[PDB]
Symmetry: D2
Subunit: 426 residues, 4 copies
Amino acid sequence: TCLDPDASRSVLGIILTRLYPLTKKRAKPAVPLGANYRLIDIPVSNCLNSNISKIYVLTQFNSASLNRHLSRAYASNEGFVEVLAAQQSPEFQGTADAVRQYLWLFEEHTVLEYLILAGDHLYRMDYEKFIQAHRETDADITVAALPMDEKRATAFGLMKIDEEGRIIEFAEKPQGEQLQAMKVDTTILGLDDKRAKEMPFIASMGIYVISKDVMLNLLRDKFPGANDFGSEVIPGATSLGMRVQAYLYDGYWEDIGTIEAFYNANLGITKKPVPDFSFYDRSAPIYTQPRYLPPSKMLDADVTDSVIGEGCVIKNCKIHHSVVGLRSCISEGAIIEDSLLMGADYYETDADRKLLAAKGSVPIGIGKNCHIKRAIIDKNARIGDNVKIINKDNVQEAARETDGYFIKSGIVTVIKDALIPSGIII
Amino acid sequence: QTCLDPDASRSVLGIILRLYPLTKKRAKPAVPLGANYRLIDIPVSNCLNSNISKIYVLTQFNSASLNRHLSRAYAEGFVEVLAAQQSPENPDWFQGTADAVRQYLWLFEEHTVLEYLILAGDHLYRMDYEKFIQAHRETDADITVAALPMDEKRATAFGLMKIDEEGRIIEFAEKPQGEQLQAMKVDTTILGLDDKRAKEMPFIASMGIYVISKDVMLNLLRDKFPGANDFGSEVIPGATSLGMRVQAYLYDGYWEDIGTIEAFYNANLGITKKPVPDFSFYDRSAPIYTQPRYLPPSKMLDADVTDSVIGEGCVIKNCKIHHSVVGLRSCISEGAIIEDSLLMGADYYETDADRKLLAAKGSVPIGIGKNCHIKRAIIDKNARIGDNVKIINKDNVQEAARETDGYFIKSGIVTVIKDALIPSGIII
Amino acid sequence: QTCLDPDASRSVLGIILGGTRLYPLTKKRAKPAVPLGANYRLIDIPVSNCLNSNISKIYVLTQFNSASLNRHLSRAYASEGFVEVLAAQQSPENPDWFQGTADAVRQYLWLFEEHTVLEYLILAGDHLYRMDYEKFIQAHRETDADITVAALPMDEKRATAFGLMKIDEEGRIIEFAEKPQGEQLQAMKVDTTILGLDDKRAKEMPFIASMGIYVISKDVMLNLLRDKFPGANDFGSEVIPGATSLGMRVQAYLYDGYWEDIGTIEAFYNANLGITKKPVPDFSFYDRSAPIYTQPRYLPPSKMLDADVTDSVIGEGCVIKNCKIHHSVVGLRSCISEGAIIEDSLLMGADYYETDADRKLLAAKGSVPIGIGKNCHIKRAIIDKNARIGDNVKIINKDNVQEAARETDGYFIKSGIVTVIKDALIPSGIII
Amino acid sequence: TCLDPDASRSVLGIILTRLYPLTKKRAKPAVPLGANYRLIDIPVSNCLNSNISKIYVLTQFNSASLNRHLSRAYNEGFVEVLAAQQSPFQGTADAVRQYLWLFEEHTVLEYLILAGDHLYRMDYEKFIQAHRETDADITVAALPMDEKRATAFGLMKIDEEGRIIEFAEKPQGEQLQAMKVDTTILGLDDKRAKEMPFIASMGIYVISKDVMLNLLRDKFPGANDFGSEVIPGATSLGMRVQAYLYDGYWEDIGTIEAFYNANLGITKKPVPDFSFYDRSAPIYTQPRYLPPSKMLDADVTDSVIGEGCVIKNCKIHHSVVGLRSCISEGAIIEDSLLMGADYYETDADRKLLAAKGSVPIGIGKNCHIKRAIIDKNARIGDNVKIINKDNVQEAARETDGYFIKSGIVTVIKDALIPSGIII
């Protein structure tokens, strides 16, 4: 394991509506995660921990907030972390189109490979072993691959490789007879019969190492009309007989690109005796903006199976199987269950409270005697007293933006900065 | 409207100048404070928030960890430690505040600045030194002394000052009493204080905080009083006696001494105050800084926590935490009961790779063990407390030095020393 | 004695407007990236003036992104503040531009609104000058202006080429006139002493021009670009006189010091050669308190084998043989071979060095290495980055041609000034 | 092959008056070098380019100046100064022992010891890699040498594994001859090995952490020097002391004459013997944002010009002109090292001085400087002639602002050399 030239100067990292309404009024890479983070911290941290310092973040539109976070957490710390926006304002586009739109600029860098990191996932990876496999196999394109169960199988592009890991057959989210014809022996990649039997597939993780020249050729010369890397470029590449290599990844990897997946993965960090995924790691930790928030205060909290973010201010309440984000105010008598509180971007001066109260408005936080269950409370929500978010009738889907929320997969998501009046029941 | 010219950044040099056993295995400025901080973070942060970036820290001896903290938490400025002793093998000490400054005057002189900001001692407080220094320049003072108004009862314990009508200081009295205390009464109204409080507190004590012009410093330490060991009681009253302009400047706000085990214990537990702590480390524009550690959100299995603060990255099982401060990286085991205590936390996390190695020897892991009961205690960094330990001090001993046993009792408070091992079943 | 409060860094957002008149220096690079004064780039001027004025949240508006521009900005500055590039078009394959200074700001006004600031400091155009925006912002606050406009005094001869302003007796602007002449001009005389000019100068310079330097309150900007003049394309000729016409408080602020536009080849050319100035540089990039910054490069001291150098300036890391260098500016990493004679020229230098393995192979293929070749004679020229000038090349323009578009041959003459294009190869023996 | 643990987290770099008066009023590590640098920049830049970020600098006393240079010119790493004197070293081993307690506080595998002052570029990683791959206790950089020069150094003898088995300080005759080794074993080609059959230590060592405490505290609690006492002692005690071939430019600059010659060595064509700039491993220094150098009428031959010089009509031959150097009308500079200045004097400043009869910073009008080192901020009056016609080799003229050593005149930093003076 020893890249040469090191990744620092020869690899350009490129990070690329199912999360509605967390993306209603913010850039998607900025969506808060794990109490003290944002989605963008996963790929940016993995790069930095893998000695990759040249990072472009492709996104739909610029955001002062996103920039502030990137600037304060990384940019001010040879490298760079720059945002490239697709349009000039916030009023769809494929993975291949996103990269093609800026190819002209990526080509301006003197690098050997492009490390393409698409989609939103929870995982820690040392991209150096990825880049190394790519260079040792003289690959044109290398795809990180994960052992998949027949279950989730058709939701990912699947592949078959030779004893070298060279991809010989790629089949996008196949089904029926082809979903069966792709099934391969997952022992050759180390796994054992037991689980080689439960996960009989090699699935693309949607991240790739692609040789500089190969990229230009593929996106502009060979497949100028392709929109997706997964379903068009990769397949295209293989049919042209290019060297498409597979790199077996064997750690935790969760898609959090949908409300329910996001929800589940966030609450998974509360698991014992070890979280599913650990943001902290002595060697490769996930970073974020340093904030100097004070230690969390708890007046009288019975907390079970939960994690508490930075600088929370909690009264007498009950918190169960939840994630409480930074700067969360939880008032007297609240009960928090199986929920993700994203917290707040600032504190209200208390004096501020006794003022909003006079006006009959509600302050940031979970109001008194609230009952929040199976929910996502986005940043700065103002939940009035006696609000009950329980969705008794187990409604699966409901678009209620006007009332401050949106239900997806039965999970109620209160919108950023929304006010849920006192007494409301959802 | 009111700005320093030249700005503080380039024209002011900051100079930062008992608590045993917290000081037994570390340099005093590195002592952990309020869950996520260290003592040295207070003056350094006040300086940085006040646009002062050239800072020296004078202490008995340095350490790689103090340096780490300082360099990592803070990095045309610098934060450099200057010591009295260069190696533990050749013990040496400063004789006082003026003595320490004098020993490195030759280095402070190499800096092109207009004034030295001297901050002596350990106190919990927030202050914006810019208005202080601006006052110094506007009054053409040689030395400006921050003055803390107090009542007659508190007054006998400090160095008091007597001012004229323009706030200029004309006399000092070190811990005065009786006839001498009375002669020191002053109309605190001259310095601001509302008439009301002015009558409540007709006294003003220096606080170990001063601004001294570069030239003035050399003259005082090298030529006028080459023998003085202390600023507050010798050098400054001495400059006043020589006709130099020593000006008073009113200090207002929280200010609490924490250089004693009991004052330190109380100030730390004070941040759990019900409405709001008397001192808030966090502040929108003048927060207290520390090192970014990227610790994970604290985890709680089944914790019942009352009137307490929890720091960064704690790992707590089922337990009871009442009126306590839980330091960063604290592990608290099944069944523990923590009361009225300060847990400093740990410097790292033991990986299960060590916990098993530790189990192969039936050894005790870092943190609070199962079914321990900890009361009115300070548990220093990385302590290994075994199962069923009860630190309750039922008899109520006030003093006991039991270092070989890992602790020390001062003012009735049990302080378990850093890295100490308190065997299972021990009862204190 | 006084200063902004809130301080500038948290309450002022700088908006630098950058991104054909400087063609071909702009043929293959973002305009803000055009090399300047041997060791700098145009963008360094406004960004430095901002940093030296305690303004740290800076946006750079330009036509298109560039790895070079970004690399220079990252290394030199990005180190709460930021320096970010906002582009008009997201490419070169899908050409897109900005219909003016107001249009550029309007396109990203929604982003600027996301910032919690009191005023926007607008810095437009390519001008060489040093200024402390702090006093400028204070006047804005102390006069409760909605817009404060930096005003440059000048005589009648110079006035017709600028947007002029008329002020009342207290310095409040009440009328504009874009490049007036004859009657419209005469009606623009004012008493500069009103703004601070001494009686002597004021008399010789009875006119004041806008300079593309404005302070605008946050709300005023929103109201102006979106509500009152949603269709205006230019600030100084449309939006600001507009604001005045509406009765907003548009206040003048005197500017006293060096200032040259460097937006045309001739002006850029003359301003660069002006730093070789005999008594003191008209403009000094270096200053005791407000230095012009650039990217640290760790270049080695320049080497001179046998150089007779008069009235010239030499940049970092040059490698020079036996030659004559006169009234010229020699950019970073410049290689000048034996016998070369350089007169009244601007050598932009090079982005890298070529060893000898490189030079050897080049000699073989019969190519030319980077730098000014042997026995060349360069006069009244701008030699862009990495040029390869062959042996015995003569850039003397004997016929005094003023204009000549000759890009296929590596150059472009404009105002009698020959500009060799970035990375161009001028074959040995060529006479221009 | 990458070190693992990598260098940044496992290796601690430790950098340790023959240059008088260049050291009369400045910390030694701060001595100006090659127009734009200072001595300390060589070892520090070599460490940085070798991925070594934890760096200590040992020196007699501290200075704000040196600290300022260190902070500004240079996560988890550091460059810190450890002073032997708290203000107004018996040897390499002494210096290290004095702060052994501090280094011990770091969790590192080895200590990279870089002693002395030399112009040289080395990639310490392969050196460390070797230390590790050979399970060495101490790895010593070896400089190949011929018989003529070897007798003036401390030599080492090795076994066929490259293991050092014996030291000899400046041996002669029979002992010298008994120190011949086969430099081929260390990797030298048969040709060069026969030309240079001897190997000297260079004051560059890699020492395992535990080994250092054991040697300095337990085994030789009273040694002063590593080269002559501790390391030969370590070998005598059977520890694994391994040699590692240093095969590159390496020049001593520890005496006025060698320092002078090395500095002027960078004017040499086609390329200097040593190059400060380098695509991959450049020497770093403080970023000063100084303006391009200005020349009114200068005839410059075989010379190098630093950053921000302000030069009038003059002749500069075979010289090195330091940053911010002001050179007045009619001056003639030859075979000299002008160290420049730490700031510029403006005309407002210049006039006031003249009004006072004082001399401004720089080479005055019609001066003739030859075979001289002009330290920082020197004020040379008009018409001064630093020629030394009687070729005096030594002379201590401090009170007069100068010093002559080896026939080289050295003007002290901030010294005033009144107009008309002839040295």
